[PDB]
Amino acid sequence: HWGYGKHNGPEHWHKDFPIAKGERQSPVDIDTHTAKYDPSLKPLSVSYDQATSLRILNNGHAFNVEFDDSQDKAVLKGGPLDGTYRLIQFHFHWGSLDGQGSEHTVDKKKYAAELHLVHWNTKYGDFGKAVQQPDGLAVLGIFLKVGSAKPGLQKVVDVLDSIKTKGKSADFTNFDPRGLLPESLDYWTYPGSLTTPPLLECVTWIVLKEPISVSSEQVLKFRKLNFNGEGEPEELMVDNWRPAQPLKNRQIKASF
C-alpha cells in the first residue's frame, strides 16, 4: 500500500487516489510576495487550555498524538474559519536531514519538520462526516527549525521509544499542546487537502509564519522511529513529507 519510498510514494498516489492531481491539493509553496494581507480575516483563536490527550500511535507513516474530541475542549476558531473546529490529533512530518522535512515551503525554503494540529468542524457531528465536506477540516501548521530545545516537546520525544514500530501505541494523557506553539499567531491561509492518501480536499490550511525551534537531539529521536512493524527489516521513519503541489490560481492570504 501507500508510503514514502520510491515505489509507493507521492508520485504513485494518483493511481489509487486520482484526486492527487486535483484543483486544491496540499501542501503548496507559500510565495510571500504573492500572498496578500486580508482585512476580512478575523482574529485567530487557539483555545487548548482544556485539551485531553489520550494516547500516541505509530501508524506506519508518522505518529499521532490523539485527543478526546467528544466535547468542545481544545478548539480552533476565528481567522478564515466559520464556527468551531475541535482538535482530534497532531502529528509531524520530518526529514532524513535538517534541510528537508516540511510539507509547506516558504519562498521554496524547506524546514526541518512541520507540526500539524488537525481539527474538525463540529457542525458536521463527527470527523468521518467532516472529511466529506469542503470546509470540514482546519489544520494548523507549524514549522520546526533546528536550534534550541523546545521544552514542551520533550514529553513527546521521551515516549517514542515505546512506539518504535507500526501499530505500537502508548498511553499519553495530560499532554498540553500549548507548549508547541510559537509566540506569534501571524499566519497564511488557503483552501487545501489532506497531505496523505486519501488526499481529500476538505481542509482550510492555517500555516504559522513563526517557526518553533527544536534541538538536534530532539529531531534525531524522531528519526529513530520505524515505518515497519515489529520483527521486520528496519526502515527508518524519515522523509514522510509530500512535496509542494500546484497552487492552481488559488489565493494564499496573510493575516499580517
Ligand X SMILES: NS(=O)(=O)Oc1ccc2c(c1)S(=O)(=O)C(CC1CCCCCC1)=C2
Residue in 1, 12, 61, 119 annotated catalytic: 61
What is residue 15's three-state secondary structure? helix
DSSP letters along 61-122, please?
A: SSEEEEE--SSSSSEEEETT--S-EEEEEEEEEE-SSTT---SSEETTBPPSEEEEEEEEEG
Tell me: does residue 181 bind ligand X (CB under 6 A): no
- Amino acid, res. 117: L
Residue window 121-140: x/- pattern of binding to ligand X, with contact defined by CB under 6 A: ----------x-------x-
What is residue 246's three-state secondary structure? coil
Q: Return the number of the residue (175 or 241) whose C-beta is nearest ligand X.
A: 241
Tell me: does residue 195 bind ligand X (CB under 6 A): yes
Q: Is 1 a catalytic residue?
A: no
What is residue 77's three-state secondary structure? strand
Grid coordinates representing 253? 492570504
Tell me: does residue 118 bind ligand X (CB under 6 A): yes
Say if residue 33 carries a ligand binding annotation: no
- Amino acid, res. 116: H
Tell me: does residue 243 bind ligand X (CB under 6 A): no
Which string of b and e fits 188-209 if b means at least 16 CB within 10 Å?
Answer: bbbbbbbbbbebbbbbbbbbbb
Task: Among 86, 116, 209, 253, indicate the residue that binds Zn ion (CB under 5 A).
Answer: 116
Binding site for Hg ion (CB under 5 A): 200-202
Rounded to the nearest whole angstrom, what is the least distance from the CB of residue 80 to ligand X in the complex? Answer: 16
Interface stretch with ligand X, choices 67-75, 193-201, 213-221, 224-232 (CB under 6 A): 193-201
Interface stretch with ligand X, choices 166-174, 190-198, 229-237, 244-252 (CB under 6 A): 190-198
Interface stretch with ligand X, choices 175-183, 191-199, 212-220, 245-253 (CB under 6 A): 191-199
Say if residue 104 carries a ligand binding annotation: no
Report the partner that residue 202 touches, choosing among ligand X, Hg ion, Zn ion, none (CB closer than 5 to 8 A by kind): Hg ion
Rounded to the nearest whole angstrom, what is the least distance from the CB of residue 128 to ligand X in the complex? Answer: 6
Rounded to the nearest whole angstrom, what is the least distance from the CB of residue 129 to Hg ion in the complex? Answer: 11
Say if residue 196 carries a ligand binding annotation: yes
Rounded to the nearest whole angstrom, what is the least distance from the CB of residue 91 to Zn ion in the complex? Answer: 6
Rounded to the nearest whole angstrom, what is the least distance from the CB of residue 149 to ligand X in the complex? Answer: 24
Q: Return the number of the residue (123 or 149) whose C-beta is nearest ligand X.
A: 123
Site residues for ligand X per CB under 6 A: 116, 118, 131, 139, 194-196, 198, 200
Catalytic residues: 61
